Design an enzyme around this catalytic site. Structure first.
Site, PDB file in Angstrom:
ATOM      1  N   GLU A 154      -2.183  -8.983   3.082  1.00 61.67           N
ATOM      2  CA  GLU A 154      -2.545  -9.521   4.384  1.00 61.67           C
ATOM      3  C   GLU A 154      -4.060  -9.550   4.586  1.00 61.67           C
ATOM      4  O   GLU A 154      -4.537 -10.046   5.602  1.00 61.67           O
ATOM      5  CB  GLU A 154      -1.899  -8.766   5.569  1.00 61.67           C
ATOM      6  N   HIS A 173      -3.729  -5.185  -0.262  1.00 63.71           N
ATOM      7  CA  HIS A 173      -3.386  -5.723   1.025  1.00 63.71           C
ATOM      8  C   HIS A 173      -3.298  -7.211   0.970  1.00 63.71           C
ATOM      9  O   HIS A 173      -4.282  -7.898   1.184  1.00 63.71           O
ATOM     10  CB  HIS A 173      -4.447  -5.388   2.063  1.00 63.71           C
ATOM     11  N   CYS A 214       0.823  -1.212   0.000  1.00 69.81           N
ATOM     12  CA  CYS A 214       0.000   0.000   0.000  1.00 69.81           C
ATOM     13  C   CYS A 214       0.865   1.273   0.000  1.00 69.81           C
ATOM     14  O   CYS A 214       1.467   1.634  -1.012  1.00 69.81           O
ATOM     15  CB  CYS A 214      -0.947  -0.073   1.232  1.00 69.81           C
TER      16      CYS A 214
END
Ligand SMILES: Nc1ncnc2c1ncn2[C@@H]1O[C@H](COP(=O)(O)OP(=O)(O)O)[C@@H](O)[C@H]1O
Ligand SMILES: Nc1ncnc2c1ncn2[C@@H]1O[C@H](COP(=O)(O)OP(=O)(O)O)[C@@H](O)[C@H]1O
Ligand SMILES: O=c1ccn([C@@H]2O[C@H](COP(=O)(O)O)[C@@H](O)[C@H]2O)c(=O)[nH]1
Ligand SMILES: CC[N+](CC)(CC)CC
Ligand SMILES: NCCC[C@H](N)C(=O)O
Ligand SMILES: [Cl-]
Ligand SMILES: [Cl-]
Ligand SMILES: [Cl-]
Ligand SMILES: [Cl-]
Ligand SMILES: [Cl-]
Ligand SMILES: [K+]
Ligand SMILES: [K+]
Ligand SMILES: [K+]
Ligand SMILES: [K+]
Ligand SMILES: [K+]
Ligand SMILES: [Mn+2]
Ligand SMILES: [Mn+2]
Ligand SMILES: [Mn+2]
Lengths: 1058, 379
Positions: free
Chosen positions: B354, B352, B268
């Site tokens: 994650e 993202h 990001c």
């Protein structure tokens, strides 16, 4: 990659006639598929025995076959069309079953037919329950403790191991067909015996119970590049133990944390990868323990389904169109998203800013001896869907759109009934079709959300919501109409309360609440479906109402609009046939240049596909909802004659409210629907009608009955009374009175009136006599036994009636022929369910023509002025749901019970009939032993039938009286004992396979209750039986034909028409 | 009757109900399409100074729980939803959404036409807004506050969120069965990654740990020099709020790591940094990407992944230096999603990987990183 080049022609396996668990959703899907492949320039060949499908419209595909979906028939089709490939995932279980049989029979090999969308092994991997269980374990997904069984002894052993209650699931079945919940050994053997016999692979899976866990589904799509997406997630309102199809469900899931959702999402994908679905979508089912998130995989369906259709409607993502495209080498990234103007690609997961609710539709009232508790085998005949900005809103809208007369949570028990809590209790604990209302009653009666939970296992997240609505209803009730201020009302409308329900509570008329809303300027706004939660704009007008700020309808000022009102959920007698008409009205008018606006909420239909109309309001078909649309659309005309009873019933009120109803007037409509009004006109026309009487009192009837003459048709549930004694009897259990026309031929006539001329669409002669509902009768076009002279008489009475009633568009007329005399049964001044069949048969799209008429273009102007009589025979036959309700006596009569129909095309009646019979899934054989057990009045004609069977090579058995008659004519059947007579008796013989054919006719309530066992056994053991002598003859004739001998396409058929 | 009101710069007013703290909040208003995961979203530092609107009507169905926190606190300025459910219904729930908002002191409004709002933002772009919840909200005030707003555009947000002192992380990923695991022992992780806290999501750390890293978290303003001194197996650039000025300190430091052979990976904000530091240009987006259903194509393998997005600024593909090769693009808007240094062992991803919340499709980006790491240690 792009489209496949090694493929030119493709055969699409259709689903066949509509049945419980396998419905219109396949017409929606098959059509999308046809559309998609033809769009991509492929040569499309399809097979579907169901004539009421948009999918079999000649202009939809290259080579359309309305023939029995039997491997040997499809074989002839393949042989004749030489399809390169075969798409078997768009036709329900029928399609998967056929593909694999085709496979098994070496047919695909024989003509070098490549299976696309899904492979034969993938299908089996998913369909074979043992194989599915093995794949899950391989991927580390958990399944309920279970056991496979191929026999009753095996079965009993698994049960021994998993205990009761246990779930039984057949391999190669869906919709819960053949399964159930066994609470005991007795229950256990029954379902087991039933499923082993029903399973295509004669195999069951028996599981430990997870009844009460949360139930979830995920709609997945996968491409050859391994790209994978979740189209929609569904959370069942009703817990594990009630089949998804018989459950209330919503989208998207509501009670899963993201963590849990990702795990379920991952598994979903894992399941498709493991089974081998590489180019298409699939439904994956799960169970979740609310106490700990513990996830269990239940099943996977390697094809489109009822959930996929619901998911497609729910999100705006056309699953089947996409999948059809995937089956031919395209990848998700290569396709564009339809509703987002093609701006974005099909490779993404939808996101929705609303709540979708589906409620199944039942018909238990048509099956009184049936067990009406909800279980793992589906029993619903249809479903409705609704969209709201909130779950409450969504839920209530669905309720009022269900067509069962509710206006939302209408009460089922009285507040003051001392036994109310006990009843409620039972309804909660053992769910039936009415559970939803009972939940509301529970709250009114003082039970707590936890009490309700405990009995129902419905998540409290839902429960609280229903409770809050009840609480609101109570206030409405306390403050009455005077407290219905604007703030409050608005609140109420926001929670989805209907003007009608409010009215009830406030003790005023619905129109009063409506007027109230107008004053306050309280109207709904319209949101659009767009698949992306407004992240992108849409050029599609697929909308739902809601009480919010911004409206997205943006109606046109531009064109002349025509509104077509849908039928809502399908139910027995209100099937896809009316939907087909609806669709055609919209397609024709649109083409003609009008702006077409559809109003319907059946997620299963072509009508609710955004591609069918210019504008789609996915709304309840009610006065309140339609008015709101008219309010802002200001259409030029509205069609109320094509959606069945639902819209027909709103006709007057719509007119009353200022709606511009087109075509036959609401008043005209009533003239025909009202008995009295109808009786006067017949009179006026000098037509023949059966003697009748309107009795008030019992003793009144007996007298008047004397007047009319027995037998008698007692229409208040209809009954045929035969004698005075019979009369009372009924009365007890128990008003029009009509003379029953015994031994008469029933006929249906579909026609179109433009005010100038009458167009005879079709003259259909029923095989079954008057007294067996037309909707459950097989029929022929053209007539197979009626004189041309008599037919001419009917054509005339129809014309006289049309003009007199002021018909404008379609009409249907039912007659009875007795002793060379024409009698009128009834007039239906709107589109009838035979319409589609007549269209297919004759090649004239009656619904399109009549819609044109309704809109202003006369028959002469369109060039449709002469009655078509095709050069071949067309026979329609029905499919009955008795098999879903074993306690019901599988006997025909004056009330309609079938769910679907098929069409058979032949050079002769015998051929047509044989095709129709086969396509109806009949187990009739050309050899064996037939059983004859006939009523008195049939005793005479049975001799001939007995001879014909003998001529075919059948051996015969007969009951006492029948044997006597046969004996006298020179025919000596082997005698069989009636149950009460001794052994062996029929039941024993039927259960032992002694017969391949049964003809059993019975007259008179008691004699009917008495012979119950024959029909019940016949059905249980898959023996073909006929319950009418007329039907018996028809069957006999067919023995002389071979349904697999010749096939013809719809295009071909149409081409032979002069 | 507990009123709440939201007013946009443009003057567009939304009247509904208060479901959080009493008071006001001003911020850039954005819309998130995520049907699940509202807690993880609210606790994402990237949301600092932002007013978050969720498109999914019912927010709060499953309550809240500590495991579902992405940071030490709520970063969202405010919360805009359509409906706050009567109850939370989920075994994992420890406190109903309203109570949680209160506890965190968040001004939140419910019962407003989020769809209207959403369409406005899409159509006319991001706007500053102000929510006011109390006895008699004053719209002109709200309007005034909205307008007065400096905004994000030309703000150093990351400094605001970053950690005051450096620290060590050795905790891995949550499991349904075990939940959040006990932190590992240094000697248990092979690698040693140094992570620059630009307002880092905890799942990023957890999933790094999962792959065998032992981390050392550092403030945004930490010097490359000071860093290098630690002998890092890998350097990680966290996610965070806003966008970095070509002007700032991290750029400079990043530049220095890129002179060395250490492996660099950003997520990001981290991605934007890497790009700037490489001679690229960032842009503010009309409304940006916020949701969890985002199709991202790995142009290198021609494969699609569904991802979790949260960004308002993006890397201009047309102004990319020749040492930056495009690795991924959005399938929604074609914007730039991934990049790799032709010359260095550096790469980044706009999305993202994650998730948390969101689909797990992009997790493998991590892997490349380990690869890199392992090969660096080979040498
Ligand atoms: N172990 C189980 N315990 C309780 N209910 C179950 C269990 N397994 C399945 N069911 C119920 O039976 C229904 C039918 O099972 P399913 O495998 O989906 O069969 P079908 O293929 O006929 O749809 C499910 O929707 C679910 O409600
Ligand atoms: N007087 C009658 N004599 C013989 N059969 C009749 C008579 N009236 C009705 N029937 C039978 O009952 C069925 C249903 O009657 P109908 O009046 O058409 O009801 P519906 O409104 O259900 O169509 C008919 O299709 C027919 O078989
Ligand atoms: O147990 C039975 C079997 C048959 N029948 C009825 O009796 C007729 C045949 O019996 P019979 O006339 O040949 O003796 C049929 O209408 C059949 O439905 C009964 O009433 N009871
Ligand atoms: C569900 C449809 N059938 C199974 C495929 C049963 C009537 C067709 C024969
Ligand atoms: N056309 C109705 C189906 C006929 C069924 N075999 C019966 O005779 O009862
Ligand atoms: Cl077959
Ligand atoms: Cl089946
Ligand atoms: Cl458990
Ligand atoms: Cl009030
Ligand atoms: Cl039953
Ligand atoms: K198991
Ligand atoms: K269920
Ligand atoms: K299956
Ligand atoms: K009939
Ligand atoms: K409001
Ligand atoms: Mn199934
Ligand atoms: Mn199922
Ligand atoms: Mn009728």
């Amino acid at each position: 990659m792009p489209k496949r080049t090694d493929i030119k022609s493709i055969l699409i396996l259709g689903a066949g006639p509509i049945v419980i668990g396998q419905a219109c959703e396949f017409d929606y899907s098959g059509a999308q598929a046809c559309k998609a492949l033809r769009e991509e320039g492929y040569r499309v060949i399809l097979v579907n025995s169901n004539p009421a499908t948009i999918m079999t419209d000649p202009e939809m595909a290259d080579a359309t076959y309305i023939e029995p979906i039997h491997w040997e028939v499809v074989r002839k089709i393949i042989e004749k069309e030489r399809p390169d490939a075969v798409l078997p995932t768009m036709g329900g279980q029928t399609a998967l079953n056929c593909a694999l049989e085709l496979e098994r029979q070496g047919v695909l090999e024989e003509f070098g037919v490549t299976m696309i969308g899904a492979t034969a092994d993938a299908i089996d991997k998913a369909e074979d329950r043992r194989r599915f269980d093995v794949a899950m374990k391989k991927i580390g997904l958990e399944t309920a403790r279970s056991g496979i069984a191929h026999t009753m002894e095996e079965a009993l052993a698994v049960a021994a191991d998993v205990g009761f209650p246990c779930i039984i699931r057949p391999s190669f079945t869906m919709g819960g067909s053949g399964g159930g919940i066994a609470y005991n050994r007795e229950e256990f053997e029954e379902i087991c015996a039933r499923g082993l016999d029903l399973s295509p692979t004669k195999e069951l899976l028996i599981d430990e119970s997870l009844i009460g866990w949360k139930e979830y589904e995920m709609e997945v799509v996968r491409d050859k590049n391994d790209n994978c997406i979740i189209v929609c997630s569904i959370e069942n309102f009703d817990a594990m133990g009630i089949h998804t199809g018989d459950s209330i469900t919503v989208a998207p899931a509501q009670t899963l944390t993201d963590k849990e959702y990702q795990i379920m999402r991952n598994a979903s994908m894992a399941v498709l990868r493991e089974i081998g679905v590489e180019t298409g979508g699939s439904n994956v089912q799960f169970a979740v323990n609310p106490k700990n998130g513990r996830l269990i995989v239940i099943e996977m369906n390697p094809r489109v389904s009822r959930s996929s259709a619901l998911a497609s409607k729910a999100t705006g993502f056309p699953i089947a169109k996409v999948a059809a495209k995937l089956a031919v080498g395209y990848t998700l990234d290569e396709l564009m998203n339809d509703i987002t103007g093609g701006r974005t690609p099909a490779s993404f997961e939808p996101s929705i800013d609303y709540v979708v609710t589906k409620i199944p539709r039942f018909n238990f009232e048509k099956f009184a001896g049936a067990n009406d508790r909800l279980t793992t085998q589906m029993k619903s005949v249809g479903e409705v869907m609704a969209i709201g900005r909130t779950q409450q809103e969504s839920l209530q809208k669905a309720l009022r759109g269900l067509e069962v007369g509710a206006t939302g949570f209408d009460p089922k028990v009285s507040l003051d009934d001392p036994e109310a809590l006990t009843k409620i209790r039972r309804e909660l604990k053992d769910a039936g079709a009415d559970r939803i209302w009972y939940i509301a009653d529970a709250f009114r009666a003082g039970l707590s959300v936890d009490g309700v939970f405990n009995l129902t296992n419905i998540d409290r997240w839902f429960l609280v919501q229903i409770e809050e609505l009840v609480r609101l209803e109570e206030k409405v009730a306390e403050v009455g109409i005077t407290g219905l201020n604007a703030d409050f009302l608005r609140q109420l409308k926001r929670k989805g309360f209907a003007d009608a329900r409010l009215a009830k509570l406030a003790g005023v008329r619905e129109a009063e609440i409506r007027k109230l809303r107008d004053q306050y300027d309280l109207h709904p706004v319209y949101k659009r479906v767009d698949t992306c939660a407004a992240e992108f704009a849409t050029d599609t007008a697929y909308m739902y109402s809601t009480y919010e700020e911004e409206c997205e309808a943006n109606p046109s000022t531009d064109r002349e609009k025509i509104m077509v009102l849908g039928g809502g959920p399908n139910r027995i007698g209100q099937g896809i046939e009316f939907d087909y008409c609806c669709v055609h009205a919209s397609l024709a008018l649109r083409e003609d240049g009008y702006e077409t606006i559809m109003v319907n909420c059946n997620p299963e239909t072509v009508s609710t596909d955004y591609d069918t109309s210019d504008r789609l309001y996915f709304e309840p078909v009610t006065l309140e909802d339609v008015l709101e649309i008219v309010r802002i659309e200001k259409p030029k005309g509205v069609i109320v004659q094509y959606g069945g009873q639902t819209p027909l019933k709103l006709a007057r009120a719509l007119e009353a409210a200022g709606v511009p109803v087109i075509g036959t007037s609401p008043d005209a409509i009533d003239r025909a629907e009202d008995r009295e009004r109808f009786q006067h006109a017949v009179e006026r026309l000098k037509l023949k009608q059966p003697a009748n009487a309107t009795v008030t009192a019992i003793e009144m009837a007996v007298e008047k009955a004397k007047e009319i003459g027995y037998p008698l048709v007692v229409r208040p549930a209809m009954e045929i009374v035969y004698d005075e004694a019979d009369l009372r009897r009924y009365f007890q259990t128990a008003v029009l009175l009509d003379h029953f026309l015994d031994d008469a031929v029933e006929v249906d006539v579909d026609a179109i009136c433009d005010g100038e001329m009458v167009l005879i669409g079709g003259i259909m002669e029923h095989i079954e006599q008057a007294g067996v509902h037309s909707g459950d009768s097989a029929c022929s076009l053209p007539a197979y036994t009626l004189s041309q002279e008599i037919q001419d008489v009917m054509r005339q009475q129809v014309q006289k009636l049309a003009f007199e009633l002021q018909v404008r568009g379609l009409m249907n007329v039912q007659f009875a022929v007795k002793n060379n005399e024409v009698y009128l049964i009834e007039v239906n001044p709107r589109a009838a369910r035979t319409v589609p069949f007549v269209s297919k048969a004759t090649g004239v799209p009656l619904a399109k023509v009549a819609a044109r008429v309704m809109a202003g273009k006369s028959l002469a102007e369109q060039g449709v002025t002469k009655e078509v009589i095709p050069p071949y025979y067309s026979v329609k036959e029905v499919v009955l749901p008795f098999n879903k309700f074993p306690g019901v006596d599988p006997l025909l009569g004056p009330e309609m019970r079938s769910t679907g129909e098929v069409m058979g095309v032949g050079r002769t009646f015998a051929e047509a009939f044989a095709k129709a019979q086969l396509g109806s899934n009949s187990t009739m054989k050309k050899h064996g032993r037939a059983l004859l057990s006939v009523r008195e009045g049939d005793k005479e004609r049975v001799v001939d039938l007995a001879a014909k069977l003998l001529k075919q090579g059948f051996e015969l058995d007969a009951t006492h009286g029948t044997a006597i008659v046969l004996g006298e004519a020179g025919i000596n059947p082997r005698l069989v004992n009636k149950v009460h007579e001794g052994r062996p008796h029929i039941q024993d013989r039927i259960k032992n396979g002694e017969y391949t054919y049964i003809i059993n006719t019975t007259s008179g309530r008691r004699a009917i209750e008495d012979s119950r066992v024959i029909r019940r056994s016949a059905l249980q053991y898959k023996v073909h039986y006929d319950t009418t002598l007329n039907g018996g003859f028809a069957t006999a004739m067919a023995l002389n034909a071979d349904a697999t001998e010749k096939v013809i396409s719809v295009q071909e058929m149409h081409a032979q028409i002069k | 009757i507990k009123s709440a009101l939201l007013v946009l710069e443009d003057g567009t007013q939304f009247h509904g109900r208060a479901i959080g703290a009493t008071g006001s909040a001003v911020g850039e208003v954005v819309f998130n399409t995520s049907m699940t995961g509202y807690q993880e979203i609210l606790t994402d530092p990237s949301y600092s100074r932002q007013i978050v609107t969720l498109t999914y009507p019912h927010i709060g169905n499953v309550g809240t729980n500590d495991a579902d926190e992405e940071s030490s606190q709520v970063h969202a300025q405010g919360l805009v939803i359509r409906d706050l459910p009567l109850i939370a219904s989920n075994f994992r729930n420890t406190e109903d959404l309203s109570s949680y908002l209160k506890r965190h002191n968040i001004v939140a409004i419910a019962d407003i036409d989020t769809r209207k709002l959403t369409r406005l933002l899409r159509e006319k772009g991001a706007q500053n807004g102000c929510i006011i919840a109390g006895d008699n909200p004053d719209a002109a005030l709200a309007l005034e506050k909205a307008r007065a707003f400096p905004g994000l555009n030309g703000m150093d947000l990351a400094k605001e969120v970053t950690t005051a002192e450096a620290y060590s992380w050795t905790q891995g990923s949550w499991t349904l069965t075990g939940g959040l695991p006990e932190a590992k022992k240094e000697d248990e992780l092979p690698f040693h990654v140094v992570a620059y806290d630009f307002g880092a999501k905890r799942n990023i750390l957890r999933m790094l740990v999962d792959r065998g890293c032992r981390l050392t978290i550092v403030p945004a303003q930490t010097s490359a020099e000071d860093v290098l001194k630690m002998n890092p197996d890998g350097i990680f650039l966290s996610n965070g709020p806003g966008d970095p000025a070509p002007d700032d300190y991290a750029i400079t430091a990043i530049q220095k790591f890129l002179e060395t052979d250490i492996p660099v990976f950003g997520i990001c904000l981290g991605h934007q940094l890497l790009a700037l530091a490489s001679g690229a240009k960032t842009v503010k987006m009309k409304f940006g990407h916020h949701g969890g259903n985002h199709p991202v194509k790995d142009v290198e393998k021609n494969v699609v992944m569904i991802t979790a997005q949260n960004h308002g600024f993006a890397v201009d593909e047309a102004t990319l230096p020749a040492n930056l090769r495009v690795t991924h693009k959005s399938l929604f808007d074609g914007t730039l999603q991934g990049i790799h240094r032709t010359d260095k062992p550096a790469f980044s991803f706009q999305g993202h990987p994650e998730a948390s919340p969101g689909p797990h499709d992009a997790a493998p980006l991590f892997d490349h990183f380990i690869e890199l790491i392992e090969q660096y240690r080979k040498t």
